[PDB]
RNA sequence: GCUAAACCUAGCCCCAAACCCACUCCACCUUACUACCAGCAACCUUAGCCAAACCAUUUACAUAAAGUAUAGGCGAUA
RNA sequence: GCUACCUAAGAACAGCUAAGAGCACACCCGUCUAUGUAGCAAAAUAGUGGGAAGAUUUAUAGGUAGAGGCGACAAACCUA
RNA sequence: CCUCCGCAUAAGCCUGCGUCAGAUCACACUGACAAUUAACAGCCCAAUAUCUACAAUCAACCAACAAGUCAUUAUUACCCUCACUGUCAACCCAACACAGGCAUGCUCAUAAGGAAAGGUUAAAAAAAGUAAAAGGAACUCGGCAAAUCUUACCCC
């Protein structure tokens, strides 16, 4: 009768044993007669580009100096982004018509 | 066998620090320093029982006055039973009453 | 490791460490040093007081928990190593520690004892100089390419041009990929 | 991808990317002689066989016939001074068969 | 809530009780508001109401620890922010009406920020305090913006 | 092919393998968007690789050829988490204004104690969501006594903390 | 007869009687587990 | 504990050095050493 | 760990007598 | 001569001062630690042991005035 | 989660004789004896026995809680 | 030689006699490494109305009483497929490697599963059986127990 031990799928009876489950993150919705119907959307279609021709490798040569840190801040960005501004004397006010929403996350990771 | 082998380290001390070199000093500052402080002024230590001696359940009583209001609860609830102890030990049970 | 560990000569991530600390001793702690601390590993220190008193050495260690130098072929004690079968083994002369304090710092023109301060000079900038006597103490101390390693070149190209776009917009765009399709909109709460 | 939000899907909206993957995973040694042509993998806990199967589709190009996942318990007998149980991580196993008959012996390292 | 002493003696039993107040339910008119509200009034309110002539009037005059009901410090809250504003209460038709009967209360009637914290709780204010410097973060962008802005200004100006 | 899952086949069986250093931060800094993903999932394979080899030598009874690079290896994924991540802040910083990307706020749940609850991703509006309402964000007047207690307990912790390390300090000051 | 097996398991029993949520379901409960807590219990409930 | 025994065995001592000549756990055990010895005195 | 001295003193003592009865000097 | 003994520093107590804590990511009120769908809601005198030698009204919860005025089966006591 | 009573939706009862019938398995209970009494057991074992298509036995989940419940009242039973 | 047990499933427990290495009634004890793979089982079912009198008992005759366990229809809505979890063991509840407790499906002498005797001696006393001359309740509170079986009569 452990209280200590991690509670999980393996624990319970039958149907507890059915409903929990580890974090796998359900790849569709259940109907009619128990028939999972997996929606393709749901699904993480991994974004694998070609890597011949490239040039950088898992490990860095030792040789290569040392150089400061610099915490890439916004104000940084924004001035490597400020000369087409400074020309003038590229920015959303919303972003709920677009794919990719920076605030409430659409994009995975 | 409770005693023990080997003898303690050699408790040195110094009779000459500036605790008690100067212990006792001002102590005494009313009656040669024309009554502007008491010697009771001089002492430091808890709020309550500074320059007043008491008893235990005096103590008690004065320490739930003076500071109760800001006590911790399980403290203050320990000093209340205290209390209601130490007045059914004094007040009742004992000898020559 | 756990609180009141002994920094012993073994380092922390050892078998003999753990034969002598495992998880469950309960010694008492050896008390001691600031970052005001003068004795590298590397540095040349003379040994004022015990074994070898007078003479000078390398150092090979500094464990600065403990306060330790370990001195090179030096303070040293003999230790059996080997062994195992019924024979004597072999015999080495292993070093002892020594707490800082008995161990100072030589000067490189006078070869004596000198105390030593952290004045931070002109030239850029804070380096050891010496009391008694004047200039500086210094300090103590190839590859070829692998096939897994990207070379000096191909590290510092820098390619980044800074948009406002995303990672992975500018992904997508590299790749050819089409999204006709847009998010519709979740209360998130 | 392992610990991240999830995006809601609802009903007409895109596909879920995963750019820069978060779990990593290791094919072992079989236990107890398996078939030519199956691979046992060890998953992270979160990632699903259909997961697995794109997985070693996209960043191996491997012909991946079909997948089959199992979770293993990890012991959570085994004592310290204390008397508290030390807990063996459970984790996720995964039977791969290749495609094409194309066939895989695990190859000795450490000759 | 107390407790009686059996036959009002002390020597015999002492025995708890609740005294409760008699309860009414009863229409009311408030030319403030221009609404009929059906509350659960006692007797003593009515005598108060009548002493004070008006209800709307009882309302204003009493204070707030002493009307004991939240529902009535609403209510004089409302009557409050109305006094303030000089709203359209009784519409098109009636303006001197309306003009008479703010008039009846002159009296009374604080500035309009005062009066829409009347009759709060703690809870209440700070649910409305927040409501108030709630607010959409202003994107960084724009303060950069108008901060280059700002430069360009001043290298014009030099 | 599964060949990517183990090194190179002259390297089975040498106990020492060279492999220099992981990314430092700065140079990550300096490259692209679309280099860091290529780089990201190189870098990917190399780790799978490396726990494959670990899991091996854990077979076997025999040690690791060379840890450390694992270790190298996993450094260099973290940086190159942070730099990406430190892009993805700014450029939201930048748009709509707001540390962190997934909503929440300051919640104070039964037990009291102020929580930051992340908000979950929904379907249905909160007022017609039957399972949230449930999950009450309130106190109520029994907790309060509670929360004087823990408060209390903290406060004796903290006590017992400091003078300890008043202690400590007298009794080094004694030794030297 | 023998009565020393008072106990007789099953989870779901446990879970409805001695759970969370249970808990939660009540003040006494919530007390309960509020009490635990300061304490500093590993198992605050079930 | 303030102020507790030291100087107790020597007490003990005291006592026993009279029954070391008995038979017995007298000889060496106290509580059953100072009846005799009393006895005896 | 007892808090005097004087007892452990003595104690000290009877353990050099003790010492002195069972292999005394030429 | 075996069992054993022995051992200081872990830390802790009382104060003084000063108003504390609480989001790497993920998960957690459904069977908590559970990615994803249409219903209710908090406030309500403490009591009793005990003392009165039983027990039934009753029985405490800075200094000084003062254990004074008062109260009280005019007693215990307050 | 024991037991007392109930609620929901379940399961079990061979063989021979002819209905809260008879004999008699499985199952349930526990008459009398012996053993056991720091025991195999904080109420057991060996036999012998009452019941065993019913007011039967029983698995699962839910309900009634102490100034109470529940009770074919034994002042039973409500985790030794 | 036993088999009054066995294999499953349920509930429960949660890696608890698999491999290697290691130590210390007789050697399931510590460390490392391995394992249980879904088709079995869980995990369900878009609305709004609207329908559901005639048991079960081989369902057929008979025969009842306590009166019962398995159903739609209309209209609108709707192409996407097989994810997730249980799957080991000499096992649970009784403090124990406890003669006790423990649901259901098969197996009703077993094709499963096991071992009453560490060795020796053969005293008393004690326990469990088997034996019996003649007699046959003379036993004892009582034919309790045992053995063979069955007559009559009260009380409640
Ligand atoms: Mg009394
Ligand atoms: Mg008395
Ligand atoms: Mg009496
Ligand atoms: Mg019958
Ligand atoms: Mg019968
Ligand atoms: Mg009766
Ligand atoms: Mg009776
Ligand atoms: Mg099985
Ligand atoms: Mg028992
Ligand atoms: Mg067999
Ligand atoms: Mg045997
Ligand atoms: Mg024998
Ligand atoms: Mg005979
Ligand atoms: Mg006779
Ligand atoms: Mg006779
Ligand atoms: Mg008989």
Redesign the interface.
């Known amino acids: 009768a452990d209280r200590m031990s991690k509670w999980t799928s393996k624990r319970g009876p039958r149907s507890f044993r059915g409903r929990k489950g580890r974090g796998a993150k359900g790849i569709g919705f259940l109907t009619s007669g128990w028939r999972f119907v997996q929606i393709k959307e749901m699904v993480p279609e991994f974004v694998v580009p070609d890597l011949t021709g490239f040039k950088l490798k898992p490990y860095v040569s030792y040789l290569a100096p040392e150089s400061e840190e610099t915490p890439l801040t916004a104000a940084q960005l924004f001035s490597e982004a400020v000369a087409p501004a400074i020309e003038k004397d590229g920015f959303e006010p919303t972003q709920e018509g677009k794919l990719f929403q920076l605030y409430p996350r659409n994009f995975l990771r | 066998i409770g005693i023990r082998l080997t003898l303690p380290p050699p408790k040195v001390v110094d009779r000459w620090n500036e605790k008690r070199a100067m212990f006792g000093v001002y102590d005494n500052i009313g009656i040669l320093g024309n009554f502007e402080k008491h010697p009771k002024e001089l002492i430091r230590g808890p709020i309550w029982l500074r320059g007043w001696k008491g008893n235990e359940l005096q103590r008690c009583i004065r320490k739930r006055k003076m500071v109760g209001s800001r006590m911790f609860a399980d403290d203050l609830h320990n000093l209340n039973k205290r209390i209601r102890y130490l007045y059914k030990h004094f007040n009742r049970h004992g000898k020559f009453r | 490791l756990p609180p009141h560990y002994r920094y012993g000569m073994s380092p922390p991530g050892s078998v003999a460490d753990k034969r002598k600390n495992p998880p469950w001793i309960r010694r008492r702690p050896v008390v001691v040093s600031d970052e005001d601390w003068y004795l590298f590993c590397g540095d040349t220190v003379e040994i004022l007081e015990g074994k070898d008193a007078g003479k000078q050495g390398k150092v090979v260690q500094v464990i600065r928990q403990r306060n330790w130098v370990v001195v090179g072929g030096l303070n040293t004690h003999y230790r059996y190593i080997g062994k195992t079968m019924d024979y004597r083994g072999t015999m080495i002369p292993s070093e002892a520690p020594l707490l800082h304090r008995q161990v100072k710092l030589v000067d490189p023109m006078d070869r004596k004892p000198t105390e030593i301060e952290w004045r931070f000079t002109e030239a850029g900038e804070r380096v050891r100089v010496s009391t008694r006597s004047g200039r500086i103490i210094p300090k103590p101390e190839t590859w070829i390419d692998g096939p897994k390693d990207t070379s000096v070149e191909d590290a510092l190209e820098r390619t980044y041009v800074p948009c406002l776009k995303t990672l992975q917009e500018e992904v997508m765009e590299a790749m050819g990929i089409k999204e006709t399709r847009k998010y519709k909109k979740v209360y998130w709460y | 991808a392992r610990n991240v939000v999830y995006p809601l899907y609802r009903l007409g909206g895109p596909q879920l990317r995963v750019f820069r993957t978060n779990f990593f995973i290791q094919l072992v040694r079989p236990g107890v002689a398996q078939p030519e042509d199956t691979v046992q993998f060890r998953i992270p806990m979160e990632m699903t066989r259909v997961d697995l199967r794109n997985y070693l589709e996209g960043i191996y190009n491997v012909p991946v016939a079909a997948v089959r996942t199992r979770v293993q318990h990890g012991s959570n007998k085994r004592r310290d001074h204390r008397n508290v149980r030390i807990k063996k991580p459970d984790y996720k196993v995964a039977y791969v068969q290749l495609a094409h008959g194309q066939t895989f012996t695990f190859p000795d390292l450490f000759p | 809530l107390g407790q009686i002493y059996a036959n009002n003696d002390k020597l015999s039993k002492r025995l708890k009780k609740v005294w409760k107040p008699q309860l009414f339910e009863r229409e009311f008119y408030s030319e403030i508001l221009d609404k009929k509200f059906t509350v659960t009034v006692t007797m003593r309110t009515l005598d108060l109401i009548d002493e004070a002539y008006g209800l709307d009037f009882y309302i204003l005059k009493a204070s707030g620890e002493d009307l004991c009901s939240k529902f009535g410090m609403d209510l004089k809250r409302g009557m409050l922010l109305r006094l303030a504003r000089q709203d359209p209460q009784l519409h098109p038709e009636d303006p001197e009406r309306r003009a008479a009967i703010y008039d009846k209360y002159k009296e009374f009637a604080i500035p309009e920020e005062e009066a829409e914290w009347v009759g709060l709780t703690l809870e209440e204010a700070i649910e409305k305090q927040r409501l108030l410097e709630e607010k959409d ?5 724009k303060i ?2 108008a901060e ?2 700002q430069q ?1 200004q001043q290298q014009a100006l030099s | 092919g599964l060949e990517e899952f183990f090194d190179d086949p002259k390297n089975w069986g040498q106990e020492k393998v060279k492999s220099g250093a992981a990314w430092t931060c700065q140079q990550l800094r300096n490259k692209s968007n679309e280099d860091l993903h290529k780089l990201w999932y190189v870098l990917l394979k190399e780790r799978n690789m490396l726990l494959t080899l670990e899991q091996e030598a854990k077979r076997q009874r025999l040690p690791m050829p060379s840890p450390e690079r694992l270790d190298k290896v996993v450094d260099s994924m973290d940086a190159l988490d942070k730099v990406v991540q430190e892009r993805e802040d700014a450029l939201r910083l930048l748009q709509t204004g707001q540390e962190r990307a997934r909503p929440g706020a300051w919640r104070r749940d039964i037990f009291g104690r102020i929580i930051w609850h992340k908000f979950k991703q929904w379907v249905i509006p909160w007022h017609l969501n039957k399972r949230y309402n449930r999950k009450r964000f309130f106190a109520l007047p029994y907790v309060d006594h509670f929360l004087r207690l823990e408060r209390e307990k903290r406060a004796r912790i903290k006590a017992r903390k400091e003078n300890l390390e008043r202690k400590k300090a007298k009794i080094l000051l004694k030794k030297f | 007869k023998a009565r020393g097996n008072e106990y007789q398991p099953s989870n779901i029993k446990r879970k409805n009687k001695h759970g969370w949520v249970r808990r939660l379901s009540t003040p006494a409960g919530v007390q309960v587990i509020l009490r635990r807590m300061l304490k500093g219990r590993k198992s605050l409930s079930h | 504990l303030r102020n507790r025994v030291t100087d107790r065995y020597f007490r003990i001592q005291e006592v026993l050095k009279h029954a070391r000549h008995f038979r017995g756990r007298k000889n060496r055990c106290y509580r059953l050493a100072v009846r005799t010895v009393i006895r005896a005195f | 760990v007892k808090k005097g001295f004087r007892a452990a003193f003595r104690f000290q003592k009877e353990l050099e007598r003790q010492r002195l009865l069972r292999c005394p000097p030429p």
Request: proline residues 20%; charged residues 0%; hydrophobic residues 70%.
């Open positions: 973060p202003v994107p960084l962008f950069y913006v280059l802005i360009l």
